[PDB]
Amino acid sequence: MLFTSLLLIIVYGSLVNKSHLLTKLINRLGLIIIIYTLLIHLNINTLENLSIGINMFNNLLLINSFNNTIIELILIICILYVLLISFNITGLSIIDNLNYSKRTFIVIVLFNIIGLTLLPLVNDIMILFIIIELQSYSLYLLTAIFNESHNSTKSALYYFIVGSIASFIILDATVSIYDDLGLTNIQYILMYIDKLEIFDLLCLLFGLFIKIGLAPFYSYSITIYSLSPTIITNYISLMPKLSILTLIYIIMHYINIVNNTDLNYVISFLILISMFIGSFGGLNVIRIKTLLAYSSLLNVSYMLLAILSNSNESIIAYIYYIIQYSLTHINIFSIILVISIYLPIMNNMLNVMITKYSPIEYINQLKNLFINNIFIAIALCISIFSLIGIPPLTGFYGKYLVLISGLNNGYVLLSIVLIIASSISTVYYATILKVLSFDTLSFKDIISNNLIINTSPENNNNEIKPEISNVISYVISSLTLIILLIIIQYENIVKGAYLVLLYNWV
């Protein structure tokens, strides 16, 4: 349904006249295609039947209940992202018309969802390399979709080079595996899981570690995320980790058969180093996207401890964490795409150049959001409080579940560092909350009419004029209450994760 509709959108888009209304309407055709895909997927795919694991397409693709969880999650998060490009994020024509200037935006996104959803299912080194390129090529194109922008093109060039080296490392590990065994199917390799150099699978992981931005490779991800348009950074900083971390978990599932300790020490060396950089790095930053880039690295460090431990509680910790972290990430970026309407306008010093690609770029552009919109400020406060790990939000249960998996497997050193690194990172999450509210009472009664939102035309002066569009507001509210009120249905959700199996059985 995804592939067939993609061809129809490719042909149709190249026929009709270049205009914003038609570009925005085609973006609403893709929102249907992704919705239709989820209905067909959930219809045939069930947890109860995919438990054993089912080979598809001459064993090239293997699907089980652990992979199947993430495909539905990926489809869901791709619906919430397409809602941004398909509806108004602000309603001001100047800021919004950027999302509709490109007709191939939705096509490239639909290309990536095919790439993302097939990566966890791969079961052959021949198709592992092909699928990882299909996902990797789609990201470079999306990073350069705004080809007029100098920073966007400079980022895609940086992205392509780093990913090309990353893909070469992945390709070289598979070749080395084929050299030793002569087999391509992953199941056939499992028969020789004790007879092959287990470090050649680690060389495979080193390639997948680059693509998720893990230190010492973290440098490029921070640069890329702080240069792309905020609508682009909202996608490329979350989606690759959804499908690669699922793949990394499976590869580590096979690896722990021989339980090689040297493999675990090197990965612990990278997890430990990344927590240090992910925490101390964000202390001295001014750009919000650079801040969320360091925040992303720290959460990936937590999620690797659940992957590295790889027990029965590690499935629960990973499955829960990857879901709550995606909703938190969408909620935060959606707010940053909206609160740009409250920016002031000059009528000077420090010569800060703002562009239509990142209207909100600095942390102090969040100033006085407690005054301009109190309800959305709390939503950003609740979201940041989840990242801090304050209970009983979603973020606490992610760290609590990760700690169970980590300590149950003897990772005492990493468990303590993650709890040190969490507190160090609380400093720079607290700065976002300091900027949001702390200067409320001095600014309470101010004469503000130079905001960007004050350039909106007055329609009637009799009817009520809401400040924020309908769809984006409903998404922000829904994900803010889900983050806040997870305590109500937490027991059902966690018991719904006990059933996700990866060859546990009995």
Partner: protein
């Protein structure tokens, strides 16, 4: 010798020189696969090599397209 990272001395100082090093690096992977496949008399390794050559070509085209638009973006006055 290469443990001191000698190959960094062998890569030129232009973005196009990096692109070539990526191709020469991947070329080594394909040659390794052709070597194993022929010794084993296995055509599955030759299917892999054929895919690697085709996939390594698509990677070049996208990289050059980004580089080409990167170049014209500076030379974009065009006010004549």
């Amino acid at each position: 010798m290469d443990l001191i990272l000698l190959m960094l001395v062998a890569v030129g100082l232009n973005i196009i020189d990096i692109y070539i090093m990526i191709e020469i690096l991947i070329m080594g992977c394909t040659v390794n696969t052709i070597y194993s496949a022929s010794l084993d008399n296995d055509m599955i390794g030759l299917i892999y090599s054929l895919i690697q050559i085709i996939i390594a070509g698509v990677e070049s085209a996208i990289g050059l397209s980004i580089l080409v638009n990167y170049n014209r973006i500076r030379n974009s006055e065009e006010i004549e």
